């Protein structure tokens, strides 16, 4: 359907949103930073389409505690507008707060000690994060796409030598000094339903090799997560402000928002 008539500031070809810091990758992927994307149009397109946003978290054990604050701050900034489903995979099921969601926002609670078909038929998107963690700042469709990785704020301005890949050549998930594009964070990466299943099948694969092998990589899916982005190149990558930690990185000029962040 048509966007309705909408004023806002016009884009100025001569005048860059961002001159400090890389706004596009090679294979012409955006890199989501403040300033780049006008947010009114992202919402306009993605309510469109009724967008409906799944967020996965795994809280196991002691991890639950983290669940009220997880969930309280997703509330205030996570795709705030849109359709949100949150998946909650614990050990305790009975530990999980209760926590008031607004409307058009529901949460399952999936018990572990199979979701293929589930996640198909009930969200367009996933997004899978860690639950350690506060949203701080807006987290929202911008981000959305077919494939997306973050940029791990310790490595944004690191040489791709420095990169902690996996380098030994007897893993499924080796890379070699000469390549690499960046070095993605493995607690916040999603996609459409379809590739998240993808990666995360490949991912599998892989991990189950090296197991065979008697290897396990050394930052484990991360890792095999960084060499299934290499080969499979994302769609967006989004900026350190959507993965960050103020206790160990403050707050650089460069980020302009600290978006999702570390509980110290």
């Known amino acids: ?58 809280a196991i054990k002691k991890y639950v505690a983290f669940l009220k604050l997880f969930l309280e701050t997703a509330e205030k900034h996570f795709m705030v507008g849109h359709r949100v489903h949150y998946y909650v995979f614990t050990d305790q099921p009975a530990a999980v707060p209760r926590v008031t969601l607004g409307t058009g926002r529901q949460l399952s609670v999936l018990e572990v000690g199979f979701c293929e078909r589930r996640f198909l038929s009930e969200v367009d998107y996933l997004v899978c994060v860690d639950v350690d963690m506060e949203f701080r700042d807006h987290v929202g469709v911008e981000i959305l796409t077919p494939l997306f990785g973050t940029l791990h704020p310790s490595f944004y301005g690191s040489s791709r030598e420095a990169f902690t890949y996996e380098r030994r050549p007897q893993s499924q998930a080796y890379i070699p000094k000469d390549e690499g594009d960046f070095y993605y964070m493995g607690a916040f990466f999603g996609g459409s339903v379809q590739e998240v299943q993808r990666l995360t099948r490949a991912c599998h694969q892989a991990m189950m090799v090296d197991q065979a092998n008697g290897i396990e990589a050394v930052w484990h899916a991360e890792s095999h997560l960084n060499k299934y982005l290499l080969r499979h190149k994302p769609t967006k990558v989004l900026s350190p402000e959507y993965l960050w930690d103020q206790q160990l990185l403050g707050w650089p000029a460069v980020l302009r928002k600290l978006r999702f962040t570390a509980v110290p």
């Open 1 to 58: 359907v048509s966007l309705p008539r909408m004023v806002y500031p016009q884009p100025k070809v001569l005048t860059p949103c961002r001159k400090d810091v890389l706004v596009v990758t090679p294979w012409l992927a955006p890199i989501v930073w403040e300033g780049t994307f006008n947010i009114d149009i992202l919402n306009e397109q993605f309510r469109l389409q009724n967008t409906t946003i799944g967020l996965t978290v795994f």
